[PDB]
Every structure is written in structure tokens, then in C-alpha cells.
């Protein structure tokens, strides 16, 4: 990629999240949102590396510190929506056009570290919290569908989670060094979701994951993403590990909850990114893996290889980009890569 533009938000507070809106239809402008402090800002990408301000939101709660955001749409009107959350522990659903909070969800006993929308049903929002649990909400009926935690749930803050491509299961990870699998295509979860639509509510309490392991990393796991049936996760050892539950030949949907084996297929090494809450991202087609480090360098790996050790790694740098890159986001068409930093700076890279 080639560096084409950069800007710094006037509040000068660290930015933690960034997400292009992958719901926009072909031909419509590529838009992304940034979040940090009590701010949520929307931008539109144009020619000649232009980054146009589209709308902005400033929470009345000056002490809020948004950590992440996720896009969806109101299925009743096909209108885009943006969910945001952070240290306050409240989920806010914002209308990106009027920048008004239309709904909010409280329940988590503490900060929310990550939000993810189901890849098929736009109403299903997953939140992971410092309170050790994951929560699934139906934002159409404003109901808490299920709480994932308890007897075999996480024992420390949940830092990240991700639905697989088809939205049949979730993998979570956190400060207890573990990675846990939660299937949501079970008769129980399908039924809970179904009844949540009927409400005009008793949520499901899921205490037992379908798989759990603490043998991948030796410290906090601050980011996890599905790579097909494989898993990509990182800790603070300057490496993203690619692994899978069970043995080399085990099928992800055939492994039992008591499976004790794991198979590491390789890793993507980098440097100077050992501070906590530094997230990696992939493009929609999952052909590229990206991760920024604490000194402004942006690593990009080509995933279309037979093994991670043979994946070409491109290091993107700009002599003026020296702040920690908390998160990056590819446009749906992989043509643009945006990075946000701890100094409120935003960097635009257009595809090579």
C-alpha cells in the first residue's frame, strides 16, 4: 500500500477502534467510524486520498472511553446503525445520520472490550466484558438473549471474541489466558433467539463452552479471530498464533467439549507490539492480515499461502507515523486500509 493521507482528531485523546461500514452497497462511498474517549466520528473516503468528515458524536458523559464499535442496520428500514461501547459498560446504538443515541443496553457489571454483530442476523449483537462474561442481545426487541459465563466461563476479563464466517459459533479470549468456544447453532440457542423476537424477558444462561484451552499463550489473549475453521490469536509475545482445537485432522464441529488437544500450525512474527489491547484485523475476503505496533509500523501479511511461515509480510511505515496503532480496518473491497493511533491520528493507505 501507499500512504495517501493522515489527520489528527482535535480532541487529541487516544483512538482505540476503527471500522469501515461493510454493509454499504457496491458503488456507495467507503465510510468508516473511529472511536476513543467520549468520541465517535464518521468519515467518507474520496479520491486523492481525501478523508471527508461526515458526522460526529460526543457523549454527554465526558468520562466515557469508547473501546470499540460495530456496524449493522435496522432491518425494518434498511438504515445503517452503529453500536459503540467502552469503559462505561453501556452499549449505545447510534443513528449515524443524526448522530443520536436511539437505544442503550446496560447489564454488564463493567467495561465492554469488544462488540460484534452476527454475520447473518443484523439484530444480534455480541458484547464481551471486563465482568468475565459475554452477552448476546437482540436489538430489535431490546432483549438479552443469553449470557455466556459461569461454572466454565471466563475467570477474568474477556478481551475479545469473534463469530465464525457463517455465524454458527463464537470464540472468546481474555485475561485468564484462555480461548473458549460457544456454539450458537444449538437447539437451545436457536430457540432462545427465536423467543427473543416474540417478546413485547428470561435470557439463557450458558455456563459451559463447547471447547476451552489455555495451552496456546502464556499470558493474556487480547485478540482472537476465526480464519476459516482455524483460529488466529495473540498475546504480548510479538506473534499472532494460528491454531486449531483438537488434533491436526479433527473437524471443528465434531470435537467434544472435553477435547484436550490443540494443534499450532504456525505464527506471524512482528516486533514492538507487546502492550495490551492492540488488535489485528483481516479484510472481508480474509486474504490479508494486518496489525499495527506501538511505534507506528503497520504489518500486513498475505494469507494466501500454504503455511504462515511462508506468508509475505509487508511493513508499512511513514516517518511521521510513530504513535501506537490500536486497530486497523480494510474497506470491504480491500482497496483502503485505515489505522488509528494513541495520539488521535488516523492514517490512510490505498491498495497497491
Amino acid at each position: 500500500f501507499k500512504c495517501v493521507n493522515s489527520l489528527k482528531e482535535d480532541h487529541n485523546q487516544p483512538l482505540f477502534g476503527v471500522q469501515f461500514n461493510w454493509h454499504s452497497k457496491e458503488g456507495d462511498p467507503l465510510v468508516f467510524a473511529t472511536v476513543g474517549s467520549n468520541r465517535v466520528t464518521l468519515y467518507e473516503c474520496h479520491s486523492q486520498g481525501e478523508i471527508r468528515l461526515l458526522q460526529s458524536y460526543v457523549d454527554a458523559d465526558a468520562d466515557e472511553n469508547f473501546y470499540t464499535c460495530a456496524w449493522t442496520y435496522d432491518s425494518n428500514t434498511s438504515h445503517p446503525l452503529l453500536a459503540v461501547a467502552g469503559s462505561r459498560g453501556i452499549i449505545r446504538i447510534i443513528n449515524p445520520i443524526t448522530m443520536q443515541c436511539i437505544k442503550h443496553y446496560v447489564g454488564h457489571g463493567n467495561a465492554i472490550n469488544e462488540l460484534k454483530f452476527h454475520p447473518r442476523d443484523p439484530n444480534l449483537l455480541l458484547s464481551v466484558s471486563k465482568d468475565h462474561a459475554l452477552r448476546l442481545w437482540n436489538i430489535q426487541t431490546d432483549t438479552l438473549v443469553a449470557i455466556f459465563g459461569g461454572v466454565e466461563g471466563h475467570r477474568d476479563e474477556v478481551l475479545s471474541a469473534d463469530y465464525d464466517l457463517l455465524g454458527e459459533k463464537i470464540m472468546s479470549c481474555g485475561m485468564d489466558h484462555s480461548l473458549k468456544l460457544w456454539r450458537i447453532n444449538s437447539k437451545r440457542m436457536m430457540n432462545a433467539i427465536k423467543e427473543s423476537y416474540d417478546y413485547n424477558f428470561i435470557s439463557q444462561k450458558i455456563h459451559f463452552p463447547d471447547f476451552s484451552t489455555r495451552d496456546i499463550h502464556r499470558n493474556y489473549v487480547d485478540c482472537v479471530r476465526w480464519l476459516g475453521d482455524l483460529i488466529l490469536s495473540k498475546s504480548c509475545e510479538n506473534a499472532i498464533v494460528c491454531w486449531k482445537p483438537g488434533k491436526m485432522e479433527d473437524d471443528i464441529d465434531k470435537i467434544k467439549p472435553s477435547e484436550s488437544n490443540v494443534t499450532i500450525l504456525g505464527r506471524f512474527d512482528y516486533s514492538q507490539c507487546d502492550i495490551w489491547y492492540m488488535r489485528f484485523s483481516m479484510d472481508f475476503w480474509q486474504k490479508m492480515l494486518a496489525l499495527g505496533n506501538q511505534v507506528g509500523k503497520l504489518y500486513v501479511w498475505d494469507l494466501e499461502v500454504e503455511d504462515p511461515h511462508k506468508a509475505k509480510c509487508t511493513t508499512l511505515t511513514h516517518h511521521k507515523c510513530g504513535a501506537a496503532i490500536r486497530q486497523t480496518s480494510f474497506s470491504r473491497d480491500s482497496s483502503i486500509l485505515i489505522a488509528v493511533c494513541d495520539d488521535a491520528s488516523i492514517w490512510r493507505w490505498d491498495r497497491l
Binding site: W22, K25, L165, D229, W285
Partner: peptide, 29 residues
């Protein structure tokens, strides 16, 4: 070869997601 074979699932599943996306007409922000 496991990593390579996994790529097939990715291609098929991202295609499914892309097809559902093609059906939508979400209003632009």
C-alpha cells in the same frame, strides 16, 4: 496442507456472505 485446505472453506463461506450482501440495499450514511 491443512492451512491450504482451510482456504477452501474461507472461499466458499465468504462467497455465501457476499451473495447475501449483494441482495441488500442498505441506505448509505
Amino acid at each position: 496442507t491443512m492451512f491450504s485446505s482451510n482456504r477452501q472453506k474461507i472461499l466458499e463461506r465468504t462467497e455465501t456472505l457476499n451473495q447475501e450482501w449483494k441482495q441488500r440495499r442498505i441506505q448509505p450514511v
